């Protein structure tokens, strides 16, 4: 009944890493590793842009007079930006770019809480010099895929129709594979060593995530202890 334990999270790259657990018993690490997988793909507090009220945009079916791309496209490239928040769950920013050039993600009103993983992610392409595009980006935090579709039912009467929304996919995690194999300790025939090979987008830290996700499993054990 030996307790379980991890080792140093082997950080090969900033995007993906691998944890390793030595103290596993026969069977546990296998089914629990699969059980963790679902959790590390569902109950994860992700960050996703929800409301983007743009300067000269009443609807996403238009193109800013001065940009190369299309507004609809630009909104998908906003979903392509990985951002971190620390204190508040929500924050409104403002993109301010002018001049011919691939608009990097570091020209925005940078709040101390807003945290980009890569300020080099081009959102749009400015092709003119006298075009200063501005856009308030309301990003927040939640978990799982929560689309603007399911959210427009309450609506709160969004009369200000300059405010164009987007689907909030709250998922940091990405590709999860687990490498089960014989755990070689000298006092036992063979235990189990779970080498969790994980891919992330680069927003929430793995250890933060796994203790947090295990606490969600704790929530999901509550009634399983209650009879």
């Amino acid at each position: 009944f030996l307790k379980p334990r991890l080792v140093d999270i082997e950080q090969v790259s900033s995007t993906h890493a691998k944890v390793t657990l030595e103290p596993l018993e026969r069977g546990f690490g296998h089914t629990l590793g699969n059980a963790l997988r679902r959790i590390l793909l569902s109950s994860m507090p992700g960050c996703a842009v929800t409301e983007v009220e743009i300067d000269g945009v009443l609807h996403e079916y238009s193109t800013k007079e001065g940009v190369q791309e299309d507004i609809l496209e630009i909104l998908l490239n906003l979903k392509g930006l990985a951002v971190r928040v620390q204190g508040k769950d929500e924050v409104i920013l403002t993109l301010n770019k002018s001049g011919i050039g691939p608009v990097t993600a570091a020209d925005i009103t940078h709040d101390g809480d807003v945290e980009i993983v890569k300020p080099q992610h081009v959102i749009c392409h400015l092709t003119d010099e006298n075009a200063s595009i501005s856009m308030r980006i309301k990003v927040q935090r939640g978990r799982g895929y929560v689309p603007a579709s399911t959210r427009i039912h309450s609506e709160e009467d969004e009369r200000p129709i300059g405010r164009l929304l987007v689907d909030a996919c709250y998922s940091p995690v990405e590709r999860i594979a687990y490498n089960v194999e014989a755990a070689r300790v000298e006092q036992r025939t063979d235990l189990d060593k779970l080498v969790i090979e994980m891919e992330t987008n680069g927003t929430i830290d793995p250890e933060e995530a796994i203790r947090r996700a295990a606490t969600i499993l704790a929530e999901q054990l509550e009634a399983f202890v209650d009879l």
């Binding site: 679902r38 793909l41 569902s42 609807h59 590709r175 594979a177 090979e197 891919e199």
Partner: protein, 49 residues
């Protein structure tokens, strides 16, 4: 007769959902019965589902 005509242009995105008939090129039809979460996807040694 009709001196003033006003033709409106609405815009409605219709996405992909369970129930839409989808196929391929080699003559393989079908209808999505239930688009399941990527969490039920069988993955290889790699991890890519």
């Amino acid at each position: 007769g009709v001196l003033k005509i006003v033709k409106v242009y609405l815009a409605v995105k219709r996405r992909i959902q369970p129930g839409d008939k989808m196929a391929g090129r080699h003559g393989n039809k079908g209808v999505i019965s239930k688009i399941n979460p990527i969490e039920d996807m069988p993955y290889d040694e790699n991890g890519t589902p």
